[model samples]
Every structure is written in structure tokens, then in C-alpha cells.
Target: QPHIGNYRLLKTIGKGNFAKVKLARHILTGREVAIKIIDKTQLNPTSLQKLFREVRIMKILNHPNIVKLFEVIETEKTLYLIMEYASGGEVFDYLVAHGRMKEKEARSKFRQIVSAVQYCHQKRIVHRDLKAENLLLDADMNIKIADFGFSNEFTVGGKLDAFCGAPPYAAPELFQGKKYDGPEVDVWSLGVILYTLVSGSLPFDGQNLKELRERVLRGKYRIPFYMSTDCENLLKRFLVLNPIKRGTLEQIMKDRWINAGHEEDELKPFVEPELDISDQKRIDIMVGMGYSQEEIQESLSKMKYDEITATYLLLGR
Candidate 1:
């Protein structure tokens, strides 16, 4: 068996520019995991910084819909990130196999996505890149947000100047090269994802980047005639050209189509004991912040497992 540290690599599951993810098992506990291996030599200082930031951000986030990081192992030549293994594969693959989902199925998945994204925003973390490809499914087909490579920390009123994310999913402000609010950009991407989920087609497309950019900037996209009026209205709210006019996560969550069947409380944001901050790294962070383990857990429950909210309460922010 090929081994990296205590993980026995079973098969190559996926690959990217500087990293390869493999299915692996922990030799000691016999737990399944996905290990992302990155070659250190291929990364410059900036890339290395981004890698570390991803690790830091992932460590701080703890939500059921977000992929869990089990451990990090560093060697002289490589970096290994052991993460929760999603046996069901990417949402993109599912979409390809099934084509456009029925409104019911798409709504189910979109609700989970909204919950995850709202949690990230509550923590003041922005997942600058959110798409079907970054969403993985577990054995039961529950959505797990997988990548944080383009994530960044943001203050409520601040604007992010960096240009990132896939162009097809990029917002108008991103193409304008102006400073933009992080959460608003994320909301735009969520709209695009929601559109693709229901329609199985991109809201805007072109043969080249220039044309794609123009189309996105103009907010030109058509909804299928078969789509329900409510669903179409929701999509229009999300795909609005002006970020200021774009529907917020809160608004999307409250839309009639999204809130159907689910109870009002279930759809509302609240802390639950299921929040996973059991890892030593996170415990140590709360401890360093002058919170007792018990107090930290209590805060997490009270704050709906929102790290930013808990921290703010602890610090009286």
C-alpha cells in the first residue's frame, strides 16, 4: 500500500494544479479519508500563504454542510491534508448523470447550500469560489462544501479588491475590477449555482471569456418556460445585475419555495449542540481566547455554532 504518514493511500480520486486528492485509510483507526497532497516545490510564497490560509479557515469553521479537516501533515517536500471522505462524489458529477433536477430535488440541495453559506457569512468568512464542482456529496447524498482555496476573511463594511473565482460564476462587480463586498459576491455565485441546479444550464455562456463577461455584466439570461413562477422569481432575485439588488441569503432562505415543508424554526438560524469543535486545534483557539472548554462549548451552542458570533460575545464586540 502506498503510504503518506499514517494514511494508506488506496486510489487516486481527483487532481488539480498543485494538489492530488486520494482515497486513503487511517491505519490506526481504520477510518476512511480523502488526503490532499501538495508538492511544496511547485508552490511559491503567495501560493503557500493561500494554502496555509485555507487550512486556518477550515480549522475555524465547523458546520455539518462543510467538509471536515481531520488533520494536517507536513513533510520536507509535501503537505498532506486529511479530510472527510465523500463517497458519493461531486455534485457536478451528479448533475451530469441526472441532467436538470426536478424543482423538488434542486430545492432540497439549495436549502443545504444556503445553510452552509449563511453559516460562513455569520462567521465572517467568504467562500469566494462556490460552484457545483466544489460541492461534494456523502454516502447519503448530503451536500458537503469541499474547497476553501479562494476563501477570505472580511469585515462587515469592508470591500475586497482581489479578483478570484471562475469567470462563468463571477459577478458584475468582479468583472468591473472595483472593490466589492465579499458576501455580496458570494450571494451572486449562489444565484448562479441555484440557476444551474434547476435549469442544468449556465445563466450566461459564450464562446470566449470576453463574450461571457459581457453577458454576465448585462445580466442576460433566460429561464426555461417549464420552470415554476416562484422558482423563476427567486432566480431573478439572485441574478440581478446590481449586487445591491441581489437577494441576500436570508431572503433566499425565506422564499416560499425554499421554506416549504420545513418548519419556521428549522429554517431559521440557531445554534445546535451538533456543532463539531471537538478538535484540539479549535479547542486551543478558544482556550487562547480566554474561554474555558465548557464556556466555549456553551457559547457555540448559544451562538448556533457560529465562531464569529461566539467570539464577539466572548470579547463583548
Candidate 2:
């Protein structure tokens, strides 16, 4: 098509199986927006209904933590969705590069994410794909929940049975071939995300799909030895396989790991702002920051496989 209804496509950002995100500018207002273009040829009747549902869900969600959808643009070839752009990148990238966060900082960020999820639940919406990748951060570190492909609205008496979401993040009931509770599955994914946030590794890991599913079903996982007792206990509570027994959002918010604000001294020891600095300047900056040889090595080891270091460094600049 010539243009997405009114928005002028600037460039491509992300391309998915059914949708492609483009950087676009509004015609009259000149406001920059990310437009997700869905291929009409690929969608069947049911899929189209789901697409419209996703759009309706986005329009109704007005919370600060959820990304806003400005308008919908339709063409014969594609359906374009205008949305807010998240500049800071995905939360998974941040966690991967930085290893585990300091307890206080982890708690602070995690609390905000939980608050966003809670808000959606209050509105009777379930985000089936509530993973770190879908949780985008802006320049100011504010979290915005994005990607409504798996989102569904369940009224006061309505229930859902669709098994969706990444396998690693899916709840055990979904794997059992039974109709399951929707929001509780989201809760399970949150636990998995939290485990990765504080431990820098997935709680349940296996050599193959069978093993992984088994471990997830059994809730077989270990807490890192370095984590505080409070953190360990909280994780244990949320990661339970049983939906009925899994800790609720209110309980999660009250947990000590979520309540801890900031412990500057504990955080100071682990902070390595130079992990993203130039390789040539890394050692020098660490030394200048009063880091000994061993301390520098430890910090570098944490970031050795990081993807967020580059973005985090740029954010600092």
C-alpha cells in the first residue's frame, strides 16, 4: 500500500511471523510511532478475529506501564497498529548482559513489573506471553508491557483454555493437555522471569524438551547459594507447579525480595559501570573505580556473555 492509512512508514524495526513493526511518523501531527503491520494474506478468519481482539484490548488498557496503541490503520494488504516505541530495549537483554542484579535494584525493578501485571489483571486481561522480552524499558528505565498477540480478556464469569506462550515459560497444566486457568499461567512465567533476574540462569534447565517439561511439571529447581534467604523463599513460593497453591500477585508484592528498597552498600560492591567501557579502557576505569584485580575479573566474568552491556552503557552516556 502507499501508506498505513495516515502514518508514513519510516523504516523497519522488527519482523514477526504475522506482523512487522515499522518506525512511522504521523501525517498531520508529525509524531513518531512504531507501527506493527500484520499481513492480511497470512491470517484466516479466526486469526483476524483474534487480531481485532488484540487491538481492542490494547485500546482499553490505559495503565502507565502498558504500551499505548494510538490507532489502527487498515489496507487491503495489511493491518497497521500504531504503538509507543521503547528505547531502552528488552528486559531479557538487560539481564543477560548484567548477570544478576543487586537485590535492592532487582526488587525495585521487579516491583514495577508486577504492578503492571496486577493492573492488567484488575482490568480482566491476561497477558499469555509475559516474558522478559515482551517487557520493554524506555530511556528513563520505566517498564512498558508490549506484544498483545497472546493477550485475552476474561470477563467476571468467563474462563479460557488456549495453551499459548513460550514453552519454557508455560505452566504445568498447559503441558498436561487439560484446559487451564489463564492468569495463573502468567504468574508462572513471572516466577521464571524473576528466577532469571536474580540468578542469571533459568531455574529449570534440562538437556532436552522432555526433561525440561518434566522439571517444570515437578517444579524442580534450585535457588542460587548466593541469594538471600528472603529471595530464596519468595521464589519457592511463586514457582510452584500447582495453580491453586501458587502465590498471588498480592503475596508476591509483599515478599521481602519485592519490598526491599535499596541497600547502597551491598549494591556498591557489585556495581561495575566500566563493563561496557572500551576494552582498552576497561582495566584502567576499573582501577580508577577502586576495583582490585580480582574484583575487576569478577565483574568482567558476570558480563562476559551479556547482550545488554552495550545498551546499558549507551544509556549511561
Candidate 3:
């Protein structure tokens, strides 16, 4: 009952609307992972659709800056999404301890954030929410974008009108209840994030929801007196009231402010570590234990998650 495939489920690390994320350890390789356990009994149709879509979206993304989905296990009563465990915790904790960062520090860290967002854009995925709380750090302190619950796939020219996500990060167009460019909304959120990172305060804030909406709609904010021209220019482009005029992720990639201040920020993208799972010894072990060898092979290639795939992955690791 404690194990999800080869991973031994441990203490609770997080929670969602219908799930509890548990820290887990691989029995054979001993690698730690996080598993979101979803109990189907509590899910209604509306929440279930988003849950299913979240898994589908997360299944396709394989960037290092994104949280890796290692495996999925489905039973009649439960669904498990095994993921890379982020030990260093959310970037929000960092901001809480240290109110703000200097431009150079912000530049180095912010590049990784932008790089991840750009990669998602290239894949035609829009992360409707992009705030510090959703960004986590690995043991290496490398930032990994997590939380695909608000993410969605879109065509280049398609528009979205989702009525979710944090209001502080919401674009002006979003508050107006219009079909808006998906990536542009994300860019606007990133603009708010950058401001929070540097100034330790939100660019648009108000005492109430009405005032906050008004502040955002009007796009009025005082720039930090010490802000550099490049940094200021990037925020201006990011926080535009017009989605068309606002900087796209592609344009943000070209902005000097988000370029490689740290060499690691420009590191080559991730590639999966190779392993020979067809080794008869490992195959024998799994097949003997009720896993279908054919499904295991196919799942490995397709990157689909299953018990067999999880076993092979843990063994391969």
C-alpha cells in the first residue's frame, strides 16, 4: 500500500485540489521523486478534465527547466504522477528571505526563467501562470518550472479566454473578459514576476480587487529610481496594455536584459540518459513480475508512464 510501483511513497510534500504529492524513493536505485496521488472518488467531471489535461501536457514537455514526469500509475481508485523531486523548494522562499536582488543577480536568475518560458512557447504551450511560487529549485539550485495545471496547448494564431490564474499576474486584457493571445498573457505575468524579483514589490497593487483591476487596466506604476535602462525597457515591453504591442517570449529572448549573465543559463538543453533495458536479465525480472515486455518497450519509446515503464526507468537508472 505504501509503494507506487517501484517507488516507496513517503511523507506528503504538496497538495492540489484532488491530489496529495508525496515524496518517494525508488526501491532499487534509491532516487527520490515526488508523486501526486489523485483519488478519483472525489473528482467531479470539470476538475477531472483539467487533471487529465495537466497530465497530457506535462507528458510531452522534456526540457531541463521543466519538471520531469517520470511515470504514471493508474488504478481504479487512484492516479499517480511520479515527478522529479525539487529539494530546494519554491523560488518564493528565496524572495521571502531576501527581499530583492541586484540587477546582475536578477539577470542571471531571470534568464533561466525566460529560457524555460521561451522553450514552452516554441512548443506552442502557454503557461497561464508564471510566478515565483510555481518555480522550484533542484538540489543544484537550478530553477525548474512546475505546475502545468494552468498550462494549455495552442496553435500559433489561436487565442484563449481562460478565467483562472492569479489576478496580480493577469494581463490588462484578461481582466476585460476578451479572447487574448495566450503567450502575451504569460509575458505579462513574467513582467510582473520580474518587477517583484527586483523591487520586492508588485508593480500594480491596490487595497481591493476593484482598485487592483483599475491599477492594472490603467498600467500606472512608478519605476524604481535605480533601475537600469535595459531592465526598464524590458518591463515596459512585457507589461504593455496591448497584447500585440507587448513583447512576446521570442522578443524577450532577444532582449539584452535576459541574456546569459551566468554561463549555466546558456547550458545546452537536457538529454535523457541512455540505458540498455533490453538486457535479458532486467527484462526477465520484470516479465517474471507481471509486467508485459512489449508494453514496457513501447512505453519507453513513446515516453508514456506505466508500472512497466517505471520499473525499467528505475532499473535503467
> Which candidate leads in TM-score?
3
In model 1, state the lDDT of residue 293: 82
Question: Which whole-number lDDT from 0 to 100 does residue 231 have in model 3?
Answer: 86
Q: Is candidate 1 or candidate 2 better by lDDT?
A: 1
Candidate 3 lDDT over 140-217, as tens digits, reads 878788874353221111124233336788889878887766888888888898887788788888887899999999
Best by lDDT: 3
For each candidate, what TM-score against the reference? 0.76, 0.70, 0.79
**Ranking of candidates on lDDT, top first:** 3, 1, 2
**What digit string (tens of lDDT, one per residue) describes model 2 on residues 150-257?**
542311111232333367777888778855656787888888888877887888767878988898878878866788998888887778877888888866666656
lDDT of 1 by residue, 1-317 (tens): 67876667998876566677889876544668788787888878887887787778877776778887666778789888777787887776787788999998888888888888888888888766665557778998888987644432210111242233367778899788856767888888888888888888888888888899999989878878889998988887778877787788876777877876776544655243654545556567657755588876665555532333333322321
lDDT of residue 221 for candidate 2: 86
Better of 1 and 2 by TM-score: 1
lDDT of 2: 0.66
User: Lowest-scoring 10 consecutive residues by lDDT in candidate 1?
Assistant: 152-161
